[PDB]
Amino acid sequence: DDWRCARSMHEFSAKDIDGHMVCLDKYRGFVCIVTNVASQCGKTDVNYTQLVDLHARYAECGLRILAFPCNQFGRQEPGSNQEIKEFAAGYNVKFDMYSKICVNGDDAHPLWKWMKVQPKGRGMLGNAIKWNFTKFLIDKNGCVVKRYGPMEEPQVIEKDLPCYL
């Protein structure tokens, strides 16, 4: 449980939604949105729609999106990885979908433990993830540069991208 001493997202690995383990150093050079998703949330439609749009408009400019399904917020992600994959398909998702994880507590994925402690990943009312669709913006070196809350629609991140692209 060495995660705290990591200096970059690129030191971490996670299982993609098809179960392949992926080393996140593949995102070196790319700016990344890392977000916790859910299918049965009141924010699901606006977030999937705008994330997909952003990725369509900025992938060639070096934007990548990592989506981590999580069922800790109102039980709004109850389905299997297979089902979640098909649900993301329904929104024409072409960014990267990961296997369902926890983001809070002792069994949280270590990337998520790490993000939450970074200087620009610190929360309001403590560091915990508060609800579905929190977003962290990660620079080309894998450092956290910003955190946006559940109610900050992905389009608000667009004005921040030229600082990093």
Residue numbers in the entry: 6 to 170
What does the paper say about this structure?
The mammalian glutathione peroxidase (GPx) family is a key component of the cellular antioxidative defence system. Within this family, GPx4 has unique features as it accepts a large class of hydroperoxy lipid substrates and has a plethora of biological functions, including sperm maturation, regulation of apoptosis and cerebral embryogenesis. The mammalian glutathione peroxidase (GPx) family is a key component of the cellular antioxidative defence system. Its eight members (GPx1–GPx8) catalyse the reduction of reactive oxidative species (ROS) such as hydrogen peroxide (H2O2) or other alkyl hydroperoxides at the expense of reduced glutathione and/or other reductants. Among the three different isoforms present in nature, the 170-residue, 19.5 kDa monomeric cytosolic isoform is essential.
In this paper, the structure of the cytoplasmic isoform of mouse phospholipid hydroperoxide glutathione peroxidase (O70325-2 GPx4) with selenocysteine 46 mutated to cysteine is reported solved at 1.8 Å resolution using X-ray crystallography. We successfully cloned, expressed and purified a fragment from Met1 to Leu170 of the cytoplasmic isoform of mouse GPx4 with selenocysteine 46 mutated to cysteine. GPx4 crystallized spontaneously in a 1.5 ml reaction tube at 2 mg ml−1 concentration at room temperature after acquiring the NMR spectrum. The first six N-terminal residues, Met1, Gly (added for the purposes of cloning) as well as Cys2–Arg5, are not visible owing to disorder. Overall, the mouse GPx4 has the same fold as its human homologue. With a root-mean-square deviation (r.m.s.d.) of 0.21 Å for 165 superimposed Cα atoms, the structures can be considered to be isomorphous. The active site of the GPx4 enzyme consists of the catalytic tetrad Sec46, Gln81, Trp136 and Asn137. In this study selenocysteine 46 was mutated to cysteine. The active-site cavity is surrounded by a number of positively charged amino-acid residues (Lys48, Arg80 and Lys135). All of the cysteine residues are in the reduced form.
